[PDB]
Design a protein around this ligand. Structure first.
Ligand SMILES: *[C@@H]1O[C@H](CO)[C@@H](O)[C@H](O)[C@H]1NC(C)=O
Length: 246
């Protein structure tokens, strides 16, 4: 398991959490020095539990699929909540079985469905450590519309930060003041599968992407990533989605 506490949190303690989150994900191989997530894990070992504590010390436990860093569901007191998708229903066979009741959320966990449920795109939803504190608090008591926004915050401040050093740093910059994600953050989130694939395809193609990945950079400029010498590959991405899952 991994844990993060909002009470007394700072960029350093958050960085330690994201480090722990990354290190909890198993891999037997690195591709261009980046850990390659496993094709599959059977049974309960598929799911990492993240214990998150809001500023007041109230807690939720979030179940994360260790092969793709997808959040499947979470436990809040004696109620479990799972996304309305087959992978999450499968997770519900293994985690939070002791919950007195299980609620299936009225949406799947993908950005597009969550944004529809929330009533806004995540371009308009501030993120940061304060937003994470709010998100945890919101998830404590069932409200499906509120929860959708909270989950958009939760996913980006945990999984996406684990996947990209840039996103982790963006949240560290938002330790005491929320701000909507940079266009670069959004671009990286949207391109994780694509980048993961092209980095793996580069292995037998002399470090060269079979298909370029278009990204938005720090300055708001759209750029093309064509090979493994790119800063996105050498410094930024921290976890690769296995091509078997793409
Ligand atoms: C590979 O990407 C680097 C970094 O962006 C770029 O400067 C260069 O033109 C590309 N090199 C090759 C061989 O494709």
């Amino acid at each position: 398991d991994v844990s993060f506490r909002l009470s007394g949190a700072d960029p350093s303690s958050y960085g330690m959490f994201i480090k722990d989150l990354r290190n909890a994900l198993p891999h037997t191989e690195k591709v261009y020095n980046i850990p390659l997530l496993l094709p599959s894990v059977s049974g309960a070992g598929r799911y990492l539990l993240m214990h998150l504590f809001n500023y007041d010390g109230n807690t939720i436990t979030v179940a994360v699929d260790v092969t793709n860093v997808y959040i499947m569901g979470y436990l809040a007191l004696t109620t479990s909540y799972f996304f309305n998708e087959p992978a999450a229903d499968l997770a519900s066979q293994y985690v939070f079985r002791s919950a007195r009741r299980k609620i299936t959320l009225p949406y799947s966990g993908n950005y597009e469905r969550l944004q529809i449920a929330a009533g806004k795109p995540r371009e308009k939803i501030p993120i940061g450590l304060p937003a994470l504190d709010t998100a945890i608090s919101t998830l404590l008591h069932y409200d499906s519309t509120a929860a959708a926004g909270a989950l958009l915050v939760l996913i980006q401040t945990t999984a996406e930060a684990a996947r990209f050093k840039y996103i982790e740093q963006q949240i560290q910059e938002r330790a005491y003041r929320d701000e909507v994600p940079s266009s670069a953050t959004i671009s990286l989130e949207n391109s994780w599968s694509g980048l993961s694939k092209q980095i793996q395809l580069a292995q037998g193609n002399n470090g060269v992407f079979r298909t370029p990945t278009v990204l938005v950079d720090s300055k708001g400029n759209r750029v093309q990533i064509t090979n493994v010498t790119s800063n996105v590959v050498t410094s930024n991405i921290q976890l690769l989605l296995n091509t078997k899952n793409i």
